Write a protein that binds this ligand. Structure first.
Ligand SMILES: Nc1nc2c(ncn2[C@@H]2O[C@H](COP(=O)(O)OP(=O)(O)NP(=O)(O)O)[C@@H](O)[C@H]2O)c(=O)[nH]1
Ligand code: MET
Ligand SMILES: [Mg+2]
Ligand SMILES: [Mg+2]
Lengths: 129, 414
RNA sequence: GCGGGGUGGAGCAGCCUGGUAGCUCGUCGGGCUCAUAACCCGAAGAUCGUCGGUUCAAAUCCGGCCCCCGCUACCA
């Protein structure tokens, strides 16, 4: 068992010294088209069932996700207003308390929905909605 | 999403000064074990710390980078959520010599050990012997040896010290303790280190049958400066459970606990209470199972508990019974050399009226001997120790030039 | 809880009751003595941490701020 050091050193000698996608909300007719929703919330492990949970209540308009991952909204809205609206998801569930890394995920449970942070792991008392 | 499971295993992180110990526990957990201001301001380990993490393995990816301790697999490039195994924690010891006795406490708690060696100090450093024999007196022969800080030392010098330490393995209880090269800062090869903890250090078979005992290591008054009288929480006593388990609203006693004045002489008072909280890090569990330090707050006043007053005491069920003897007998076999010593002289056998230091589990005492026999002694103590089992692992030292270096291994026959 | 010290080579006075930056060990010069120490006299030395308000007018009333800080501990 002398090889238990050699290769481990050889690959020890190979380790020596994400951002928000620019959501472009456009409108044609009475709809809302986006560009990179297959890699906007899937950059932070956000389901298509859970990302359209609070937005349906905050816009009061029906809608669903597509097969590619894009999100279609029924209604006319500007670009930088969707974020100012969905702040109650962008700050209430996908942030942390001491790291501010944005690399966080939500949990689904039987009594509350927690904030699993891949920087620290800090949660808060909140009830899913 | 990943379950919330308390740790089921402890691992002793021991080694000499500047070895990369606290930075190793940072390499595994992401958090450090320097928690009192002096520890930072002096930059050396004075006391034992705590740190926690999980383990998940990506069933698809190759070994070992996928062995990451968070609900993610992205370091191996996979989208899958890894298989969870456990939640793993450590006992971060000091390297200093006036501070050695402390880690002996933790030696009675760990279910494993990762021992570090300095590639960038002359080997074998004196105190390394003392750590090795600490593990050998307590008897946790399960050891993972590591050479550290390899980024300044070349691969040939690393090989030479690897041969030195492969040799350090042969001829003792540790013939096959392995060496997996990592560096504690740059986060190199730590995946293979986690794999090593897993494979070679498994959690023992648990005994949920014996009277649940809690071995105190620390305690605090969480009542912050400015705490008004409406929200007063009890004083937390933290340790690790080894045999049995603890539950919410369990009726216990702290033993020995306080000193009080009794009958014209000195004695101690058994400290009775009801269990009000049991914590594992940042997760709230209603039961405490063995494996990992378990903090229990109760209906006790934290003035009796703040600032590590009761250091090392035991706590048992308020329907239990433990022998409390002011003067205890010991079967002690003497070390062949003084292990942490720069120059290893002989052991000068223990003569009557001498002063000796004991660490029982986590509790510590000074004592003077009253009846000196070759293998058996009866020593008068300044405080009675609680001996929950037969012939418990005490660790014994005599004072050398102001540094209490060990002299043998002892057994209290109750 | 946030607050204090901000000033000759120095040590602190010195506020509220605003117009001498105040006394002492020190520093150079002169007296007294046969000469030295002690004792008497004269000058030199910060010009108040700094912007700003009050104020005819400010260490002196205080605020903004730059520095030194300062009574204080892991909060399972
Ligand atoms: N480059 C490098 N520096 C390290 C590593 N581990 C620790 N250091 C740094 O080197 C110095 C000494 O290491 P230290 O962290 O004290 O290791 P230690 O064994 O825990 N020392 P002690 O237990 O006495 O407190 C510190 O400045 C520390 O940040 C490592 O793996 N690589
Ligand atoms: C450092 S005490 C170990 C466990 C404890 N619950 C913490 O927090
Ligand atoms: Mg250390
Ligand atoms: Mg004279």
């Amino acid at each position: 068992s002398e090889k238990e050091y050699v290769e481990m050193l050889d690959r020890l000698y190979s380790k020596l010294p994400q951002s928000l996608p620019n959501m472009i909300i456009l409108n044609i007719g009475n709809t809302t088209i986006i560009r990179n929703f297959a890699e906007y919330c899937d950059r932070i492990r956000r389901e298509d069932k859970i990302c359209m949970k609070y937005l349906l209540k905050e816009l009061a308009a029906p809608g669903n996700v597509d097969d590619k991952g894009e999100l279609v909204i029924q209604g006319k809205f500007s670009s930088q207003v969707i974020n100012t609206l969905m702040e109650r998801f962008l700050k209430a569930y996908v942030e942390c308390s001491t790291c501010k890394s944005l690399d966080t995920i939500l949990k689904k449970e039987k009594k509350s929905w927690y904030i699993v942070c891949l920087a620290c792991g800090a949660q808060t008392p909140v009830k899913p909605l | 999403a990943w379950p919330k499971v308390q740790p089921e295993v402890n691992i002793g992180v021991v080694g000499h000064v500047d070895h990369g110990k606290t930075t190793l526990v940072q390499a595994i957990t992401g958090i450090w074990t320097s928690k009192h201001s002096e520890e930072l301001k002096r930059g050396m380990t004075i006391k034992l710390g705590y740190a926690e993490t999980n383990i998940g393995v990506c069933e698809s990816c190759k070994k070992p980078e996928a062995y990451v301790t968070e609900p993610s697999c992205k370091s191996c490039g996979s989208d899958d959520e890894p298989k969870f195994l456990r939640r793993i924690s450590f006992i971060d010891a000091p390297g200093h010599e006036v501070l050695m006795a402390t880690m002996l406490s933790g030696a009675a708690l760990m279910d494993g050990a990762i021992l570090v060696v300095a590639a960038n100090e002359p080997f074998p450093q004196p105190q390394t012997r003392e750590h090795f024999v600490a593990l050998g007196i307590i008897g946790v022969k399960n050891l993972i040896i590591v050479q550290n800080k390899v980024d300044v030392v070349s691969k040939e010098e690393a090989l030479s010290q690897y041969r030195q330490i492969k040799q350090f393995t042969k001829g003792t209880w540790a013939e096959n303790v392995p060496i997996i090269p990592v560096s504690a800062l740059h986060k190199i090869n730590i995946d293979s280190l986690i794999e090593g903890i897993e494979e070679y250090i498994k959690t023992p078979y648990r005994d949920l049958s014996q009277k649940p005992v809690m071995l105190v290591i620390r305690s605090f008054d969480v009542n912050k400066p400015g705490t008004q009288f409406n929200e007063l929480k009890g004083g937390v006593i933290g340790g690790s459970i080894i045999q049995g388990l603890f539950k919410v609203d369990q009726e216990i006693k702290v033993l020995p606990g306080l000193r009080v004045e009794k009958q014209g002489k000195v004695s101690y008072e058994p400290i009775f209470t009801k269990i009000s909280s049991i914590r594992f890090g940042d997760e709230e569990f209603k039961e405490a199972k063995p494996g990992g330090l378990v903090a229990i707050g109760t209906y006790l006043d934290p003035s009796l508990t703040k600032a590590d007053n009761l250091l090392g005491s035991i706590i048992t069920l308020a329907d239990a019974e433990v022998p409390v003897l002011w003067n205890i007998r010991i079967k002690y076999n003497l070390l062949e050399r003084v292990v942490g010593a720069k120059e290893m002289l002989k052991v000068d056998p223990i003569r009557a009226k001498e002063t000796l230091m004991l660490s029982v589990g986590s509790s510590t005492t000074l004592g003077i001997v009253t009846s000196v026999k070759k293998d058996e002694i009866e020593v008068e103590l300044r405080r009675p120790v609680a001996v929950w089992s037969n012939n418990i692992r005490t660790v014994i030292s005599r004072q050398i030039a102001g540094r209490w270096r060990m002299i043998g291994w002892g057994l209290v026959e109750i």
